[PDB]
Amino acid sequence: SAIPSVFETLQGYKVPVFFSRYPAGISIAAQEVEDALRKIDEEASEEGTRERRRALIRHTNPYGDPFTICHCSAFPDRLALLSCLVEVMWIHDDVTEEMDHISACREHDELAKVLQLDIDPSKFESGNVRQKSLAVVLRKAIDIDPKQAPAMIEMLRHYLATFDNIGGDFTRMEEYMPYRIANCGYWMSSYFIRWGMDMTLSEEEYASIEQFDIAMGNVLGLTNDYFSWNRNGVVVLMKEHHTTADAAKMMLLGVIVEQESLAAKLKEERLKKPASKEILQYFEAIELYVGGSCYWHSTAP
Amino acid sequence: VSAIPSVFETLQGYKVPVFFSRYPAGISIAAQEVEDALRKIDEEASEEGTRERRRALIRHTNPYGDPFTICHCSAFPDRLALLSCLVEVMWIHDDVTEEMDHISACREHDELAKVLQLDIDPSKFESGNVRQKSLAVVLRKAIDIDPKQAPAMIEMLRHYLATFDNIGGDFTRMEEYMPYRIANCGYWMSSYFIRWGMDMTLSEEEYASIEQFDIAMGNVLGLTNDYFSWNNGVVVLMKEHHTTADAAKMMLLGVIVEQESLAAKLKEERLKKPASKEILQYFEAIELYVGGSCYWHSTA
CB atoms within 10 A of CB A163: 21
Q: CB of B33 within 8 A of CB of B27?
A: no
CA distances for A252 relative to A170, B160, B247, B249, B262, angstroms: 15, 35, 10, 11, 17
- Secondary structure (3-state) at A74: coil
At B292, which amino acid appears?
A: G
Q: Residue count of chain A, please give it.
A: 301
Residue A8 forms beta bridges with which residues?
A26
Name which of B18, B22, B254 is nearest A254 (Cβ-Cβ).
B254
Vertex B191: Cα angle to B189 and B197 (nearest 5): 100
Q: CB of B274 within 8 A of CB of B209?
A: no
* Residue among A6, A10, A7 at smallest CA distance from A294: A10
Question: Which helix (H) or strand (E) covers residue B169, if one does?
Answer: none
CA distance A60 to A300: 8
- Give the distance, in angstroms, between the CA of residue A37 and the centroid of all CA atoms in the same chain: 15
From chain B, pick out residues whose CB is under 8 angstroms from the CB of A252. Answer: 254
Q: Residue count of chain B, please give it.
A: 300
Q: CB of A261 within 8 A of CB of B21?
A: no
Of chain B residues 34-73, which have a CB less than 8 A from chain A? none
CA distance A281 to A74: 11
Number of H helices, E strands in chain B: 14, 2
* Residue among A69, A213, A92 at smallest CA distance from A163: A92
Q: Say if the Cβ atoms of A16 and B261 lie within 8 Å.
A: yes
Question: If you write DSSP's letter for every residue of A16-79 in order, what string do you get?
Answer: TT---SS--EEETTHHHHHHHHHHHHHHHS-TTSHHHHHHHHHT--TT--HHHHHTTTS-HHHH
CA distance A233 to A231: 7
CB atoms within 10 A of CB A1: 9
With 0-12 CB in 10 A as exposed, 13-18 as middle and 19+ as buried, what is B60? middle
CA distance A178 to A175: 6
Residue B11 forms beta bridges with which residues?
B25
CB atoms within 10 A of CB B254: 26
Question: If you write DSSP's letter for every residue of A148-185 in order, what string do you get?
Answer: THHHHHHHHHHHHHHTT---S----HHHHHHHHHHHTT
Q: CB of B105 within 8 A of CB of B93?
A: no
From A95's Cα to the closest Cα of chain B, the distance in A is 33
Question: Which helix (H) or strand (E) covers residue B68, if one does?
Answer: helix B67-71
- Residue from A251, A261, A270 whose CB has the most chain B CBs within 10 Å, to mutate: A251
* Residue among A31, A23, A33 at smallest CA distance from A1: A23
CA distance A121 to B227: 56
* Residue among B133, B292, B107, B283 at smallest CA distance from B195: B283
At A32, which amino acid appears?
A: E
Name which of A247, A264, A265 is nearest B251 (Cβ-Cβ).
A247
CA distance A294 to B127: 60
* Residue among A139, A138, A135 at smallest CA distance from A127: A135
- Secondary structure (3-state) at A300: coil
Nearest C-alpha in A relative to B227: A254
CA distance A240 to A255: 14
Q: CB of A51 within 8 A of CB of A91?
A: yes
Nearest C-alpha in B relative to A245: B241
Name which of A249, A254, A260 is nearest B252 (Cβ-Cβ).
A254
Asked if B252 reaches chain A (Cβ–Cβ under 8 Å), the answer is yes
DSSP B148: T
Resolution in angstroms, to 1 decimal, for this deposition?
1.7
Question: If you write DSSP's letter for every residue of B172-208 in order, what string do you get?
Answer: --HHHHHHHHHHHTTHHHHHHHHHHTTT----HHHHH
CA distance B61 to B168: 31
CA distances for A60 relative to A63, A299, B146, angstroms: 9, 11, 55
CA atoms within 13 A on the CB side of B236: 21
Nearest C-alpha in A relative to B262: A16
Strands A25-27 and B8-11: unpaired
The structural domains of chain B, ordered by start, are: 8-79+167-299 (1.10.600.10)
Asked if B258 reaches chain A (Cβ–Cβ under 8 Å), the answer is yes
Vertex A281: Cα angle to A144 and A149 (nearest 5): 25
Expressed in angstroms, the distance from the first to the final Cα of chain A is 32
Vertex B101: Cα angle to B96 and B103 (nearest 5): 105
